[PDB]
Amino acid sequence: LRPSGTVSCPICMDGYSEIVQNGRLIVSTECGHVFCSQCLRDSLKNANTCPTCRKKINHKRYHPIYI
Amino acid sequence: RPSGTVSCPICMDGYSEIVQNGRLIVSTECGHVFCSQCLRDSLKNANTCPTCRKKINHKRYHPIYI
Ligand SMILES: [Zn+2]
Ligand SMILES: [Zn+2]
Ligand SMILES: [Zn+2]
Ligand SMILES: [Zn+2]
């Protein structure tokens, strides 16, 4: 059982207290998707995208300049 | 309220009260959580997080060194 309206990680299936009492953090992507810190890091080892919605969660900070 | 409560500290509305009435839970980049409406309201007159006061309005311009 995984009630709607509760904080949990969809990867490891751990709830809020299980996550924080083990020394992990709750994290969010910028697209609003919530994970535990360990699961999202493990995910980003094999992919640059959000596990949930697959939006790119890397951002390279450079841009064209027009002289 | 207690650890694991998703609520806005400004209006004090709990999770259910926020999302069911067309607002959203929002987080600043500094990890601080509010309802969409209270955070937006605060950002109309200040550029900083209401909780930790980190500046959270970026500057989409910068020097270029040529
Ligand atoms: Zn997890
Ligand atoms: Zn996402
Ligand atoms: Zn609020
Ligand atoms: Zn903050």
Side-chain angles (χ1 to χ4, degrees):
Chain A
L1 187 64
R2 189 66 263 161
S4 290
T6 57
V7 176
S8 70
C9 181
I11 301 172
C12 65
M13 315 314 292
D14 284 349
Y16 177 83
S17 299
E18 298 173 287
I19 293 159
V20 299
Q21 298 173 3
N22 201 49
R24 290 171 282 161
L25 302 174
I26 309 306
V27 295
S28 184
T29 61
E30 286 187 8
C31 39
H33 306 120
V34 171
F35 302 93
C36 85
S37 46
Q38 186 69 259
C39 291
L40 187 57
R41 284 203 309 269
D42 290 342
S43 290
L44 305 173
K45 205 82 207 164
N46 216 288
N48 62 1
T49 46
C50 178
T52 296
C53 76
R54 284 295 174 206
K55 192 217 83 216
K56 181 170 174 53
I57 62 175
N58 274 25
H59 183 326
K60 280 160 188 170
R61 298 178 259 165
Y62 74 95
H63 61 266
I65 57 182
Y66 297 108
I67 293 313
Chain B
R1 313 207 48 86
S3 296
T5 306
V6 179
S7 66
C8 185
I10 300 170
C11 63
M12 293 294 168
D13 292 349
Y15 177 74
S16 289
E17 296 94 297
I18 295 160
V19 299
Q20 297 187 17
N21 297 294
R23 296 128 71 200
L24 296 178
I25 309 301
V26 300
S27 183
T28 61
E29 48 165 357
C30 35
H32 303 129
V33 168
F34 302 93
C35 79
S36 46
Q37 188 58 263
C38 290
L39 189 55
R40 278 209 307 276
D41 280 0
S42 183
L43 290 171
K44 288 169 187 166
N45 298 134
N47 282 335
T48 51
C49 176
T51 289
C52 74
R53 289 296 181 200
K54 171 173 169 73
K55 183 163 83 69
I56 65 187
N57 202 353
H58 179 241
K59 323 206 340 216
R60 295 177 159 156
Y61 78 91
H62 58 271
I64 60 178
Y65 294 108
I66 48 160

